[PDB]
From TrEMBL:
<keyword id="KW-0732">Signal</keyword>
<protein>
    <submittedName>
        <fullName>Carbapenem susceptibility porin CarO</fullName>
    </submittedName>
</protein>
<dbReference type="Pfam" id="PF16956">
    <property type="entry name" value="Porin_7"/>
</dbReference>
<dbReference type="InterPro" id="IPR031593">
    <property type="entry name" value="Porin_7"/>
</dbReference>
Length: 218
């Protein structure tokens, strides 16, 4: 079925017009993830599922990136606490750590830093809208360095399987020529085990990115 799973694999291809990008990633959850309590896309977050993840990324037109990530949710007598660590190597070595807390149930705030330098902050929320099968998710991100970059994403879970969303980011300070990024995103779980999706992303200072993705749970 896929409503209880411990692994998720995900693939994604993208074309960037101003070229090719591919990403495969694997996730292992330390505990069974129960996806029947809200939108299926956010089941790991909703059950505070610790895990480790590996990924590979390809860019052609030429560049390969391998990465590993872990997240830890740790209940305490006060608030649930959260830490993350990741590392990426590109053929270029970057890492990130974060610590934070669930200030209210399903609301995560996390601060951290990353380097080869920047402090980061982020928040995540996922709530059911009371009296229906809909839900909403928000994520916001700040990266604070010489200058700052910011971003947000919103997802409308119009049913537990279907989501449509949008995102925005200001990146003048990432030192490509690009100033603003916006996107729309769609995802649908055909079964709790299988989801496919689409992404359309524009950037300016020019550029567009069309993308399809898929994911399998077991």
């Amino acid at each position: 079925q896929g409503l209880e799973y411990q692994f998720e694999v995900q693939g994604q291809s993208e074309y960037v017009d101003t070229n090719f990008t591919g990403t495969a990633q694997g996730t292992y959850y330390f505990k069974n993830v129960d996806a029947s309590k809200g939108p299926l896309a956010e089941a790991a977050f909703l059950n505070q599922a610790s895990n480790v993840s590996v990924a590979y990324n390809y860019i052609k037109y030429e560049s390969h990136t391998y990465g590993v990530k872990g997240e830890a949710y740790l209940p305490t007598p006060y608030l649930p606490v959260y830490a993350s660590a990741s590392y990426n190597h590109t053929i270029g070595d970057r890492y990130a750590l974060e610590a934070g807390a669930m200030l209210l149930p399903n609301f995560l705030v996390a601060v951290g830093y990353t380097s080869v330098d920047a402090v980061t902050a982020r928040t995540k929320y996922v709530g059911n809208i009371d009296g229906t099968n809909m839900a909403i998710g928000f994520e916001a991100f700040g990266v604070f360095a010489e200058d700052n970059a910011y971003g947000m994403k919103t997802d409308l879970f119009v049913t537990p399987k279907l989501s449509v969303g949008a995102s925005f980011a200001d990146v003048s300070a990432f030192n490509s020529g690009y100033d603003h990024v916006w996107g729309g995103h769609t995802q649908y779980f055909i079964t709790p085990a299988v989801a496919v999706g689409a992404d359309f992303v524009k950037a300016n200072a020019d550029t567009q990115t069309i993308g399809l993705n898929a994911k399998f749970r077991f």
